[PDB]
Amino acid sequence: GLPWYRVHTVLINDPGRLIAAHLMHTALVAGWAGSMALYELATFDPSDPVL
Amino acid sequence: TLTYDDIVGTGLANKCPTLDDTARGAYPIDSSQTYRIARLCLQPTTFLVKEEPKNKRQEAEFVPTKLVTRETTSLDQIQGELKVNSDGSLTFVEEDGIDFQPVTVQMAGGERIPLLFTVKN
Ligand code: CLA
Ligand code: CLA
Ligand code: CLA
Ligand code: CLA
Ligand SMILES: CC1=C(/C=C/C(C)=C/C=C/C(C)=C/C=C/C=C(C)/C=C/C=C(C)/C=C/C2=C(C)CCCC2(C)C)C(C)(C)CCC1
Ligand SMILES: CC1=C(/C=C/C(C)=C/C=C/C(C)=C/C=C/C=C(C)/C=C/C=C(C)/C=C/C2=C(C)CCCC2(C)C)C(C)(C)CCC1
Ligand SMILES: CCCCCCCCCCCCO[C@@H]1O[C@H](CO)[C@@H](O[C@H]2O[C@H](CO)[C@@H](O)[C@H](O)[C@H]2O)[C@H](O)[C@H]1O
Ligand SMILES: CCCCCCCS[C@@H]1O[C@H](CO)[C@@H](O)[C@H](O)[C@H]1O
Numbered sequence A: 001g002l003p004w005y006r007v008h009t010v011l012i013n014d015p016g017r018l019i020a021a022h023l024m025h026t027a028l029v030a031g032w033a034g035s036m037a038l039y040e041l042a043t044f045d046p047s048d049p050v051l
Numbered sequence B: 001t002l003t004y005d006d007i008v009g010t011g012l013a014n015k016c017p018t019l020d021d022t023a024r025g026a027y028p029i030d031s032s033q034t035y036r037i038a039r040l041c042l043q044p045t046t047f048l049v050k051e052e053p054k055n056k057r058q059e060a061e062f063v064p065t066k067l068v069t070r071e072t073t074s075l076d077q078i079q080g081e082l083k084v085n086s087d088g089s090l091t092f093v094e095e096d097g098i099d100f101q102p103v104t105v106q107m108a109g110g111e112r113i114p115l116l117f118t119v120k121n
Helices: A003-009 A017-044
Strands: B035-041 B047-048 B062-064 B075-084 B090-098 B102-105 B112-118
Touching: A003 A017, A017 B035
Parallel strands: none
Antiparallel strands: B035 B075, B047 B062, B075 B090, B102 B112
8 A cells, every 4th residue: 555655645636635635734833823822922921021 | 969879880989079160269277166077088090000120220110000890999988187287287187987998900911919099097
């Protein structure tokens, strides 16, 4: 069957599932941005922009 | 004159009585008689809290805050002696009244600062 390093090649001839995989990637990256910002807000001390 | 039922829930119960623009007169003091403040009312419109910076040499400023305990902040029904002094100064000496309110305000960023807003004694 397909080697582990080729599993995503099933998408090459499948525009709909390629778009779906793209959307998922996009969901992951936007979710990262959101999560990252909240973690930063939960830890950031805004009390001294000087030092 | 409004009744309780006119006032209940409006927020007006936490407001001190006001006077018209026309009240720019003069209340005589006759050093012969004794006087009293029969009602003193104090209504806070702003709470400022002094910041505490990491070094002196920065003059620390008083900054605005957000009140989180609602319309519960006013002092009222306060009374006491209004003395006439030798030099004709007056001295108010508070005896009794609703002369304190606990208050919590919040600094920018959320730190809560409770205080006992008061003119006791
Ligand atoms: C953007 C990321 C992404 C997307 C959109 C896809 C999408 C796809 N994969 Mg691929 N894949 C990925 C990343 C992705 N994969 C990664 C990182 C691996 C290595 C584990 C794989 C390994 C893989 C295999 C072995 C197979 C696919 C297959 C497929 C297809 C069917 C779905 C599936 O079986 O997933 C399976 C993959 C997963 C479920 C990923 C596992 C989740 C990892 C471990 C992250 C855990 C998430 C968790 C919520 C957070 C952990 C936090 C931490 C602090 C512990 C589809 C085209 C299948 C197929 O079509 O092959 C022809 C198939 O057999 N994928
Ligand atoms: C947009 C960027 C992009 C995209 C869409 C692809 C897409 C593809 N690549 Mg290419 N590739 C890329 C960039 C990309 N590549 C880069 C930067 C390199 C050098 C690192 C390569 C080197 C490369 C090789 C050597 C091969 C591919 C192959 C493939 C195909 C199968 C992939 C697969 O099933 O992996 C499945 C992968 C897993 C099941 C697990 C991988 C786990 C990785 C190693 C570590 C963990 C990854 C982690 C989740 C990373 C997320 C962080 C992000 C910033 C990158 C697919 C068409 C294969 C191919 O041509 O098949 C015919 C193939 O042999 N790629
Ligand atoms: C009007 C024509 C049009 C428009 C506006 C777009 C726009 C887009 N296409 Mg392209 N595309 C088109 C024609 C179009 N396409 C045609 C005729 C084909 C051949 C069928 C393609 C084949 C194609 C592929 C294969 C892929 C794209 C992808 C993309 C997206 C890339 C950026 C992204 O994900 O941002 C981030 C997204 C946002 C910030 C959200 C935007 C708001 C969305 C669009 C509203 C959704 C509602 C709408 C009714 C659904 C249909 C949308 C569709 C017209 C794009 C973007 C939304 C990629 C994709 O979708 O990645 C996820 C992708 O893989 N397109
Ligand atoms: C320009 C920005 C950019 C680009 C071009 C990509 C491109 C890629 N991403 Mg995305 N990514 C981005 C930004 C980007 N990412 C951001 C901002 C996030 C939020 C953190 C992610 C989160 C994300 C996740 C969770 C996943 C991807 C995956 C992918 C790959 C999907 C196609 C594939 O099958 O490759 C096949 C894989 C490769 C060719 C290998 C890529 C190797 C990278 C470049 C080096 C890292 C390898 C290193 C050994 C890992 C150590 C990590 C370990 C210590 C935990 C592709 C290489 C998916 C993927 O790798 O699926 C297997 C996947 O699961 N990305
Ligand atoms: C469903 C839904 C929803 C929700 C959503 C959510 C809640 C989401 C989330 C999301 C998220 C929360 C996401 C996250 C993501 C993340 C990620 C994607 C990450 C990744 C990472 C990585 C990739 C890393 C890597 C590395 C390491 C680990 C180490 C060092 C090096 C490196 C960097 C390489 C709502 C309600 C809105 C509505 C609609 C429906
Ligand atoms: C319609 C419907 C529904 C839906 C559902 C859904 C749609 C869900 C979703 C789900 C999801 C989609 C979820 C998510 C998950 C996520 C995760 C699990 C994540 C993780 C992450 C992490 C772990 C992170 C980390 C980090 C970063 C990344 C940066 C910053 C730092 C930190 C560390 C924080 C239901 C069933 C309800 C029912 C009704 C109907
Ligand atoms: C949409 C997904 C769900 C949303 C949930 C994720 C939101 C996370 C980030 C929002 C930022 C608030 O982040 C959080 O703030 C409070 C108040 O400063 C801090 O709370 C900490 O400091 C205050 C001092 O004021 C203490 O009363 C408290 O006991 C202490 O743990 C947390 O250390 C911080 O993590
Ligand atoms: C996705 C919804 C985000 C939830 C927002 C949390 C309130 S906002 C949050 O409030 C804290 C205390 O006032 C501040 O210290 C912190 O700096 C601020 O990020």
